[PDB]
């Protein structure tokens, strides 16, 4: 009846037709059919992305690939709890009004000049999107932007609004690239290839600092704003109070343990996922310090994402067990033999960068990182590189409305068109493809 319902039923027909008409070994065809089914469900978002995550195990058990608990244990990978600690910290420095005070304390340094305050906004947004979230910080910042731009006109010099808002949302989606926490695809990659915090920052932070100024430049040049002006913000200013400095101490200590986590771990006894134990310790420090209450951490966190991590991991483990990934790798051996590596990562980056515009970031990553990480384990390639690339590119959703929520938050206001976003995001996605390809080809060496 409904559209998505027809999508699902066509998906089931496709899966049955594959399962029956694909002449292979049973496990190859089973994994192929599950992959097609899950993919069509994770791109079209017929069923909530997390419902499909849940459905992955149910089809990994009902066909004998796994024992129930061996599948359900995918939903407890230490990266899930690292992201839960990230959500706890976000809730602490939101409920306790830390992010807002940070923003106001930055803007005030730009005494009254918008020309520097907008770049302050971009820096702040990409400095908070690391930890807090991509949607939440964009929603928090849009009011600040409008307060910055209540002076200027909305129809005459509208390019200024487009610049400010797009830069904000772009900066959120980018700053999400700078920490495991910050965007789910980071964690999907890390869990699929076993990465730490500071063993992922090495790929994230340089990329974010090399891609954010790029995007700001391309906005400033495709759009010719009138950023000269004065700055009148109307809200009761904020100030440091006990409970915020405590939260800052806890947050800084947690980040410190996260960064220097190998030297500390070795000096403690060598535990496997010490960043996750740092995250849990952050939860406990916060709760024992009373800055946050678990009700906030449960109202804020997105447990759908935390079930998605497990669903994608189970799909990875399915493509592993069934040897589907190896079947493909053997099927694509000649093409990838002729194609080097530069072309491989170029194709991957192009595909995901122009995909996540139409699909979601988290779902697209959960779908592809398993596929390509396994197919790369088969080929010998390092799954770390491809997983990181697909987690960094899936964030690049700069082209149109809901591809990331931030774009849609901005394009709720109505001061930006669609065509301008399409053009800007096209140029930006090309440049980001170039940048990802270059910094990857570097990290290879």
């Amino acid at each position, epitope marked *: 009846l409904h559209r998505n319902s027809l999508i699902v039923l066509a998906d089931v027909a496709l899966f049955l037709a594959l399962y029956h008409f694909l002449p*292979f070994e049973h496990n190859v065809v089973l994994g192929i059919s599950m992959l097609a089914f899950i993919a069509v469900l994770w791109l079209t978002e017929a069923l909530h992305v997390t419902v499909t995550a849940i459905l992955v195990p149910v089809m990994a058990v009902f066909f004998g690939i796994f024992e129930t608990q061996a599948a359900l244990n995918n939903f407890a990978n230490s990266i899930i709890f690292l992201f839960l600690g990230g959500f706890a910290l976000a809730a602490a420095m939101h409920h306790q009004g830390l992010d807002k005070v940070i923003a106001d304390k930055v803007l005030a340094m730009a005494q009254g000049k918008m020309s520097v305050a907008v770049f302050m906004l971009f820096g702040v947004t990409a400095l908070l999107s690391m930890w807090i979230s991509n949607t939440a910080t964009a929603a928090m910042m849009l009011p600040l932007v409008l307060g910055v731009l209540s002076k200027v006109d909305a129809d005459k010099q509208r390019s200024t609004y487009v610049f400010v808002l797009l830069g904000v949302a772009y900066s959120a989606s980018i700053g999400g690239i700078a920490t495991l926490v910050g965007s789910p695809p980071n964690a999907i990659a890390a869990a699929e290839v076993g990465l730490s915090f500071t063993d992922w920052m090495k790929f994230g932070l340089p990329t974010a600092m090399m891609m954010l100024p790029m995007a700001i430049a391309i906005l400033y040049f495709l759009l010719k704003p009138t950023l000269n002006g004065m700055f009148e913000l109307d809200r009761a200013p904020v100030n440091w109070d006990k409970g915020k400095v405590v939260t800052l101490g806890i947050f800084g200590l947690t980040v410190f343990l996260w960064i220097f986590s190998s030297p500390i771990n070795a000096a403690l006894g060598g535990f496997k996922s010490f960043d996750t134990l740092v995250a849990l310790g952050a939860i406990l420090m916060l709760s024992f310090a009373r800055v946050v209450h678990w009700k906030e951490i449960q109202k804020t966190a997105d447990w759908g994402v935390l079930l998605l991590f497990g669903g994608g991991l189970c799909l990875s483990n399915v493509l592993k067990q069934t*040897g589907t990934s*190896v079947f493909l790798a053997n099927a694509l051996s000649d093409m990838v033999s002729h194609m080097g590596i530069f072309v491989v990562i170029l194709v991957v980056a192009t595909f995901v960068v122009f995909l996540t515009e139409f699909a979601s970031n988290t779902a697209s990553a959960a779908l592809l990182i398993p596929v390509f990480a396994t197919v790369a384990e088969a080929f010998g390639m390092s799954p770390v590189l491809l997983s990181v690339l697909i987690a960094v590119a899936a964030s690049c959703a700069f082209m149109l409305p809901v591809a990331t929520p931030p774009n849609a938050i901005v394009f709720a206001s109505g001061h930006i068109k669609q065509s301008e976003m399409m053009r800007v995001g096209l140029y930006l996605n090309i440049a980001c493809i170039g940048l990802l390809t270059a910094i990857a080809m570097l990290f290879w060496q």
Partner: antibody
Framework: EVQLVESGGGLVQPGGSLRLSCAAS????????IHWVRQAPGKGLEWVAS????????SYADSVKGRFTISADTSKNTAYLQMNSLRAEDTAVYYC????????????????????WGQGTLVTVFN | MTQSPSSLSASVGDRVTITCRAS??????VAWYQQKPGKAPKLLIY???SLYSGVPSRFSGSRSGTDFTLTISSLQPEDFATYYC?????????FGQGTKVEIKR
């Protein structure tokens, strides 16, 4: 704990046929690739064939395509290399190694690259 | 894939290096093997440089593009053997042409 025992290697005539078996213990063939490696008579190592049974995906070397055929039945553990149309330039000491690929994220005695080979079955094509 | 040098004349205590060029710049699956005459090869390094459990620390590896490389810091009298590089690409393997280190005089 883990070991691979190679059998079926012996005398043969050209245009003939033989069949080596590589019985495994300590792991499951289902979760690893099996690799058949003829060294040479008094020369260096040469790779011949490979199989991943979970998929049935086999890869022969460019020198043995319509002459060899690898196979594997799980449920005990095995990896058979049926050699056919054996030529004079095929006498050697065939080893059978395991290569784990995927790291499996939970647990396995799996190794990661040809850690555990065997001892060698010598086949001597003969006139 | 192609492995150089063919033969190495190295005295004990010396540091020796071996190079292996791949010609398929996709697979970082290069592993290094130590074979004594007639015996089964013994693994040292698996991906390109990361060491194996049961091997001395003097056996190090490097990638440097496609010019994979093996390094033995202190050449001990038991490290005189034949060294091979294998590159897995998918399911198919291919070893190196063979490197032989001999105690010089």
């Amino acid at each position: 704990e883990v070991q691979l025992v190679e059998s079926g290697g012996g005398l043969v005539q050209p245009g003939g046929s033989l069949r080596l078996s590589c019985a495994a213990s300590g792991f499951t063939i289902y979760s690893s690739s099996i690799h058949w490696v003829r060294q040479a008579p008094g020369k260096g190592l040469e790779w011949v064939a490979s199989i991943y049974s979970s998929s049935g995906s086999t890869s022969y070397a460019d020198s043995v395509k319509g002459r060899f055929t690898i196979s594997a039945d799980t449920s005990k553990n095995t990896a058979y290399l049926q050699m056919n149309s054996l030529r004079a330039e095929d006498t050697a000491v065939y080893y059978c190694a395991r290569y784990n690929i995927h790291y499996w994220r939970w647990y396995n005695p799996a190794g990661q690259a040809m850690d555990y080979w065997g001892q060698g079955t010598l086949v001597t094509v003969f006139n | 894939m192609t492995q150089s040098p063919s033969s190495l004349s190295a005295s004990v205590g010396d540091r020796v290096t071996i190079t292996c060029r791949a010609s398929q710049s996709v697979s970082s699956a290069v592993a290094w093997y130590q074979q004594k005459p007639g015996k089964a090869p013994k693994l040292l390094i698996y991906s390109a440089s990361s060491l194996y459990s049961g091997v001395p620390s003097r056996f190090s590896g490097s990638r440097s593009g496609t010019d994979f490389t093996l390094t033995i810091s202190s050449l001990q009298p038991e490290d005189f053997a034949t060294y091979y590089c294998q590159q897995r690409y998918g399911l198919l393997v291919t070893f190196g042409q063979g490197t032989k280190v001999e105690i010089k005089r």
